[PDB]
């Protein structure tokens, strides 16, 4: 039926993606070696959103886990539940970038890019009528966001018309751990705006912020970050896998949020989240996670909504719940002020509500809000850009294999009129 | 007690020689005697100098 | 069958070649038909 | 498959390959006698040795590495040390005439018999790569194998190999106490042909290494076994992370594009933050942020250069050991917003992390302890300019009354070969004052 | 039944054909006195239980023959089989041609005669020999006239040590080589050839060996003559008959004379810390060091190119290494030879012989080339009796021994066609 190809690419994404295919696998009952042992009839039905269907009743995944460098894929064979992929579908390469664009977009990523898309079509092919596609990113890397550049636009051309999800995580910009980031980032971006139908902006800095001040976690590790964000893997797809008595699957909520085409950069979040003693002196109503999923600490981008307004704003919902009390407590969202709401769109709300909540919980929520405050976040990498540029730091690297001094200044010019298609609805 | 004799060894031979942890076995034991019989050798012409 | 074939050869051919042995000629535990003194190796 | 093939050349260099490899036979569950022995050889699940070991058809494993020097002695107390068997003894190359102190004999009178056979040597190491990180030079600025014999091996493996990446190990002559009074005409005729043909070439005194061991090590009369546990544990930890796996693995390739801003700026200097004699480890707490702010002290450095007179150009930490990465970002926005720690103004961003999982390791003897974790930083300061102002002038004067020229002259060299390479420094004199200057 | 019958003539003969049989009886599992505690090869087996070879063994000098005799194998051989003169052929073509011969050729030929009538399914002859000396020229020359015009078509193979360019230890040497070249032109089947200066030259490198004896020669002429023959006796992938030589090599019926090398010849303290895989053999074949008769290879051109591999080896790690020979441009194959090569493979890995110094290799390879090369030789081996015969040094004995002085001149252009063949068949 309704499918969906997942794609993941990059050091950073491998380890996003192994940690994404847990809570999809153990959400529909699949052991570790691949078969079936749920326990509700309803668990089955749509598990051909995102596996296949071996013999002898075992499940695969639809995942490619491209890598330039095979020190990373070693890992996720001896993963815990890293065996049920297809060993097809694993694809790496001899010669790493190394954090250069110009190395992840000409030189070895061409002679790559087609041992990937071969295995595109394939898991493409046992589709009946395919609906879009997934991919993981992190956008300070040469050889994940490097190689993402060339495998969205090539996979466009080929299948224009599907709705081709991309996530990306933006770079932390208050210490950054790379130093020729801005020439990675601000080259991404560019091709991050004309190509992708649907994408979402992670600053992980904010989830040291939200695993600090809320969760109270004490020691994390980059896997247990890479829960939050799989929390919210899951939870913008739950329509397609799942019953609904207000539904909304991936197309109806990017044609229904998404004004004018070259703005879909969201900041995401997650209502029900607390610490293990403090959730039990918390409540779980309704009106609780929608005093949530807006608080400006619970978010997930480090853009705060108080310089500016929101465009549209979304909220998925897991779990069976009335709908007069998560609408009156919508409607009191837009209507307590009217400077961070847009006067000249007149509602701004979007409602979904499944009937299968995560287990764990009785109530969740996935927040998805487009603001206008987003612009600070690219004129602080426009200034960060232009403060290498000046002086030509770092770019005898990148010239070397196939660019020249035009390719940036393009990239820029493309970069800062971004924030005026930001400024001028914002003011 | 001829279809005994005949049959297990021709079962024997045929299934040994259709298996496989066995290939890596014979190999790994070839390899094993003949650097064995190398050092031997090396060590006996040595005591002959 | 082919697994007792297996353990029918190990057992007569790999007796007497103990001070060494390559990587893959042996997996899960096949010393205890030769138990008497793989063992203490 | 990845690989490394370390290639060394001089007195100086087999006497770092001695207390290197004893290193890495350590690491990995290996023996003097090359075979690993019983436990691990049933299961055989490792495969981290592969990098730097080869492996024969009968179980034994032989490195790769090759010996290179004009002086007969110092190779042969390798084939009767303890290592006798571990090298195959094709790869101990060996002179018979020496070098004896002359740049101008080690390029060309001697080296000429011996440039073809290592490269015959070296063509069998880099054969067996599926795909090569990266050579490994470790030389001197001393005499004539390690400063005249290495600068013809760069000008014919870059022609052989090309874009293929080839770190560099290096010591460096002392401001002031050195042991050779011909030695800065080759510290200035070896870096004028290591400004085109090499990628990254780190820099060490020997002299700062002798402050730090009355100072942090607490040894009273360090000899020379000493000085080469410090750089091989250095190089233990630049290549750390490619054979055991990591949070943020760097590679070898990920450093040459990652420090150099441009492209004869490449003389980053390192240091090894958490060196703590046995007892003091007993008494000091190591924890992940404080061993981040102990690399940017006036004392442990390597180079004697004091970085308060000049400005950051970039950094580059490799961590090892237990470390979680909440707790290393909280270090780095210290030492970035403190006021001393000077950071050029074309660098807003500066800082490169890399996290590995394996702790360090203890050689028996060593006078090193087991520390839980350590890092290991690498930076190209603009302070190094600083230095050169006191080496080329030691030239200056020498070849002002023409002093010591007449054996160079008379082994094979023109006397033209000083005046382009005293005009050649005088530009990278300039090179890092044009670069240091803030922005018009 | 591929039956062969050796005979050894000449001290080269005798000389090699100790260090052959001490290798072919320690080759099966045969005792060397004849008992024992597939070989009906080179066996005839007598009911007492004992192992007779194939073998007739002549000189004309006693000592030689008399040390064999009292040696270490004599119960191994029917002594009457050890054939022995009175008077030495002294170095003399004519003598050991029309003179001395003319008493032992008659029995050698009746042995030669039970020996074949105690076979049953005959395949040839192995005739050891020089290009030395009077009695291995002139009495080779009649056994193989003889045998030619009495046996029929049948392969006399002959094997014969070569004359170095700068290594002789006569000083008539070009005399009776360029006359046995010139009268076994004909009647042998095909005549490999060996220099005693190049198997010096790949003992002090290869071997790592100082100072050779001439049985640390003969041990390398045995290991080449049991890769020649290990196929009929041991049976292989691909077995190649002794008759399939003469269809294989040989072009031109003057051509018969290809070259030999063997590999793996490498010492045990080296070969302990290197593998020789089948690639790495069969391309250190085609060296101009690791070759075994001094002719510059690069100079000439290959015609044809038969190897022998012995062991274990699977058939595609050959034939991919053979294109990858093929394909380099340098190593020049004749544009009238687009198949090259010719391959056998034998199962049985290479023997060790007690006392001796090649390390147990468990895969070899014996190449049969023949080239162009071999022109300088014959250039230099006709300049030589050029400049002695310009003057008439040393005819005087051989013309009181039975010649006219126009057959040396008849001999010297019926030589001297063969050097214009080969530039026929090569330009």
């Keep these: 039926m309704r499918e969906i ?10 380890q996003i993606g192994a940690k994404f295919w ?7 009952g699949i052991d570790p070696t691949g078969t079936y042992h749920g326990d509700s009839d309803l668990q089955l039905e749509r598990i051909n959103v995102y596996y296949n269907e071996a013999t002898g009743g075992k499940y695969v995944p639809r ?42 977009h000409y030189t070895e990523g061409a002679e790559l890019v087609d041992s990937v898309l071969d295995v595109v079509r394939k898991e493409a092919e046992s589709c009946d009528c395919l609906q879009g596609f997934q991919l993981t990113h992190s956008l300070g890397g040469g050889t994940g966001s490097g190689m993402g550049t060339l495998l969205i636009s090539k996979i466009r051309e080929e299948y224009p018309d599907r709705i081709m999800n991309t996530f990306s995580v933006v770079p932390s910009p208050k210490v950054s751990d790379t130093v020729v980031e801005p020439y990675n980032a601000t080259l991404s971006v560019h091709q991050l705006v004309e190509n992708t139908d649907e994408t979402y902006c992670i600053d992980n800095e904010a989830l040291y912020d939200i695993c600090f001040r809320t969760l109270k976690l004490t020691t994390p ?85 108080r310089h500016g307004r929101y465009l549209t704003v979304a909220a998925v919902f897991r779990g069976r719940m009335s709908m007069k009390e998560v609408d009156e407590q919508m409607l009191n969202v837009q209507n307590k002020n009217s400077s961070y709401f847009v006067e000249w769109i007149p509602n701004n709300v979007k409602t979904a509500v499944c009937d299968i909540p995560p287990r764990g919980l009785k109530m969740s929520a996935t927040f998805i809000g487009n603001s206008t405050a987003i612009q600070e976040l690219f004129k602080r990498i426009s200034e960060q850009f232009t403060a290498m540029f000046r002086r030509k730091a770092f770019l005898h690297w990148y010239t070397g294999e196939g660019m020249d001094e035009m390719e940036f200044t393009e990239a820029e010019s493309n970069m800062n009129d971004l924030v005026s298609e930001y400024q001028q609805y914002q003011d | 007690l001829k279809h005994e004799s005949l049959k297990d060894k021709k079962m024997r031979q045929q299934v040994r020689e259709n298996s496989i942890e066995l290939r890596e076995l014979e190999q790994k034991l070839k390899a094993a005697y003949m650097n064995k019989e190398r050092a031997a050798q090396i060590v006996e012409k040595d005591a002959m100098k | 069958i082919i697994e007792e074939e297996r353990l029918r050869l190990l057992k007569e051919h790999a007796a007497k070649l103990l001070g060494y042995l390559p990587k893959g000629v042996f997996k899960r535990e096949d010393d205890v038909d030769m138990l008497g003194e793989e063992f203490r190796k | 498959m990845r690989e490394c093939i370390s290639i060394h050349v001089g007195q100086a260099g087999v006497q770092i390959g001695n207390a290197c490899w004893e290193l890495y036979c350590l690491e990995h569950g290996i023996q003097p006698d090359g075979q690993m022995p019983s436990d ?33 002695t110092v190779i042969d107390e390798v084939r009767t040390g303890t290592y006798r068997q571990l090298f195959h003894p094709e790869q101990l190359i060996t002179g018979k005439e020496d070098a004896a102190n002359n740049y101008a004999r080690g390029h060309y009178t001697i080296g000429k018999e011996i440039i073809d056979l290592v490269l015959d040597r070296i063509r069998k190491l880099a054969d067996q790569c599926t795909g090569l990180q990266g050579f490994l030079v470790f030389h001197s600025f001393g005499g004539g194998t390690g400063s005249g014999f290495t600068s013809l091996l760069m000008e014919r493996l870059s022609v052989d190999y090309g874009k293929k990446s080839k770190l560099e190990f290096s ?48 040894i009273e009369r360090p000899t020379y076994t000493n000085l080469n546990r410090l750089i091989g544990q250095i190089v233990s930890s630049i290549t750390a992370s490619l054979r055991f796996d990591g949070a943020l693995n760097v590679d070898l390739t990920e450093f040459q594009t990652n420090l150099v801003p441009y492209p004869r700026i490449h003389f980053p200097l390192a240091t090894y933050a958490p060196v703590i004699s046995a007892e003091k480890a007993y008494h000091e707490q ?10 940017f002290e006036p004392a442990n450095q390597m ?45 807003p961003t500066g800082f490169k992390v890399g996290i590995n999982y394996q702790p360090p390791t203890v050689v028996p003897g060593g006078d090193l302890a087991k520390v839980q974790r350590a890092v290991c930083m690498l930076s190209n300061t603009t302070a190094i300019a600083e230095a050169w102002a006191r080496l080329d002038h030691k030239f200056d004067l020498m070849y002002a009354k023409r002093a010591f020229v007449h054996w160079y002259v008379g082994e094979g060299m023109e006397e033209g070969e000083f005046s382009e390479a005293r005009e050649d420094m005088a530009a990278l004199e300039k090179d890092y004052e044009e670069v240091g200057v803030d922005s018009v």
């Design chain 1, 5 to 14: 190809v997942h794609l993941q690419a990059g050091q950073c994404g491998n």
């Design chain 1, 22 to 28: 847990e809570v999809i696998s153990d959400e529909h």
């Design chain 1, 63 to 104: 995942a490619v886990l491209v890598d330039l460098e095979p020190g990373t894929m070693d890992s996720v064979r001896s993963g815990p539940f890293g065996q049920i992929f297809r060993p097809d579908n694993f694809v790496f390469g001899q010669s790493g970038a190394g954090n250069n664009w110009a190395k992840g």
């Design chain 1, 221 to 305: 590790t980059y896997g247990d970050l890479n829960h939050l964000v799989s929390a919210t893997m899951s939870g913008v797809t739950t329509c397609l896998r799942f019953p609904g008595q207000l539904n909304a699957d991936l197309r109806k909520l990017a044609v229904n949020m998404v004004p004018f085409p070259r703005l879909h950069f969201f900041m995401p979040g997650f209502a029900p989240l607390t610490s293990r003693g403090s959730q039990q002196y918390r409540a779980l109503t309704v009106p609780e996670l929608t005093q949530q999923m807006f608080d400006a600490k619970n978010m997930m981008a480090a853009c705060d909504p």
């Design chain 4, 40 to 72: 691990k050889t049933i299961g055989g699940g490792d495969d981290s040795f592969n990098t730097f070991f080869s492996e024969t058809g009968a179980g034994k494993h032989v490195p790769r590495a090759v010996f290179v020097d004009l002086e007969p």
């Design chain 4, 171 to 218: 010591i460096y002559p002392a401001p002031q106490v050195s042991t050779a009074v011909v030695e800065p005409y080759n510290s200035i005729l070896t870096t004028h042909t290591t400004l085109e043909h090499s990628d990254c070439a780190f820099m060490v005194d020997n002299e700062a290494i002798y402050d730090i061991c009355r100072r942090n090590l607490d």
């Design chain 4, 286 to 295: 190591l924890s992940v942020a404080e061993i981040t702010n102990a690399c």
């Design chain 4, 303 to 347: 180079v004697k250069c004091d970085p308060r007179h000049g400005k950051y150009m970039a950094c580059c930490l490799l961590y090892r050991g237990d470390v979680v990465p909440k707790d290393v970002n909280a270090a780095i926005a210290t030492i970035k917003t403190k006021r001393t720690i000077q950071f050029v103004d074309w660098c």
